[PDB]
């Protein structure tokens, strides 16, 4: 497939395994496996091939066109996770990727309906896209994420409806803020929702600077790039 240098291979795998060892060590230190989503945004496809060949399957991309271009160049069994800003007009585009495993940035009912809509038309055959609801856990104003309980509840209601058959509600997601109060707020959102809808939501929180704490607060998935591709 994509050709890569041997010195970079040895270095990428080393840095990755070291990140994965700390994630596993942190997890094993609590009261069962956490996903290490490898955020390859802006990284070349050769780097992904390096890790792919190493056994890695789940990579996170933030840009729609980049993910699509990347998906066509690399193996079909990669489990792409779209973790960037989602515009309703790009849903149709994303839905076309067969191996689009997950979309963690659904932050409106309009978007959920459009992705489910698009997925039905272009890849009804393919497995339902696993989805996370992005919530603004910061107590500040943030360009993305939901903060309104009524609107959040309305998004969850649709996911559990019979009409939503091509995208599956998996959990909650947050970019945090800039002990962790943000992860704490996400944890509280999962309880209020699990209680009201009878769900057992999966949490996606924790990045390069705070994945350890996220791991301590119950995360089911951490998204790390910098620590792995440096
Ligand atoms: C880029 C990004 C990450 C990862 O942070 P790193 O310092 O690169 O580990 C995780 N989640 C989202 C939504 C991102 O934009």
Atom 5 (ligand 1): residue with closest C-alpha?
207
Q: State in Å: Cα 131 to ligand 1 middle.
A: 17
**Experimental method, per PDB record:** X-ray
Q: What are phi and psi of 96, to 5 degrees?
A: -70, -30
User: Which of 170, 187, 184 minimizes the C-alpha distance to 35?
Assistant: 170
Find the length of the chain: 230
d(CA 84, CA 39): 11
Crossing angle for the helix pair 64-73 and 45-54, nearest 10 degrees?
60
What long-range pairs does 36-40 form, CB within 8 A, spacing at least 24? 36/222, 36/224, 37/81, 37/83, 37/204, 37/221, 37/222, 37/223, 37/224, 38/224, 38/225, 38/228, 39/83, 39/207, 39/223, 39/224, 39/225, 39/228, 40/70, 40/225, 40/229
Question: Which ligand 1 atom sits nearest the alpha carbon of residue 208?
Answer: 9
Residue ranges around ligand 1 (CB below 6 Å)? 39, 41, 62, 83, 175, 207-208, 223-227
Alpha carbon of 209 to ligand 1 centroid (Å) = 10
- Contact predicate 159/131, CB 8 Å: yes
Resolution of this deposited model, Å: 2.1
What are the structural domains, with CATH classification, of the chain? 1-230 (3.20.20.10)
Token digits for 219? Answer: 């995360």
Closest by CA position to 40, among listed 22, 24, 16, 17:
16
CA of 176 to the centre of ligand 1 (A): 10
């Amino acid at each position: 497939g994509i050709t890569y240098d041997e010195d970079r291979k040895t270095q990428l795998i080393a840095q990755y395994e070291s990140v994965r060892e700390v994630v596993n060590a942190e997890a094993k230190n609590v009261h069962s496996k956490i996903l290490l989503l490898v955020v390859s945004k802006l990284k070349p496809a050769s780097d992904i091939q390096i890790l792919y060949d190493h056994g890695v399957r789940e990579f996170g991309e933030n840009y729609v066109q980049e993910l699509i271009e990347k998906a066509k160049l690399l193996p079909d069994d990669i489990k792409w996770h779209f973790i960037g800003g989602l515009q309703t007009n790009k849903c149709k585009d994303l839905a076309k990727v067969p191996n689009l495993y997950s979309v963690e940035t659904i932050d409106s009912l309009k978007k959920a309906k459009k992705l489910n809509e698009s997925r039905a038309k272009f890849q009804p055959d393919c497995n339902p896209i696993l989805c996370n609801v992005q919530i603004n856990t910061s107590h500040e104003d943030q360009k993305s994420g939901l903060n309104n309980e009524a609107e959040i509840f309305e998004v969850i209601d649709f996911f559990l409806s019979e009409e939503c058959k091509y995208i599956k509600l998996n959990g909650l997601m947050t970019i945090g803020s800039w002990e962790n109060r943000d992860f704490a707020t996400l944890v509280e959102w999962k309880k209020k929702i699990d209680a009201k809808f009878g769900t057992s939501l999966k949490l996606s929180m924790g990045m390069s600077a705070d994945f350890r704490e996220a791991i301590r607060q119950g995360t089911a998935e951490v998204r790390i790039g910098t620590d792995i591709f440096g």
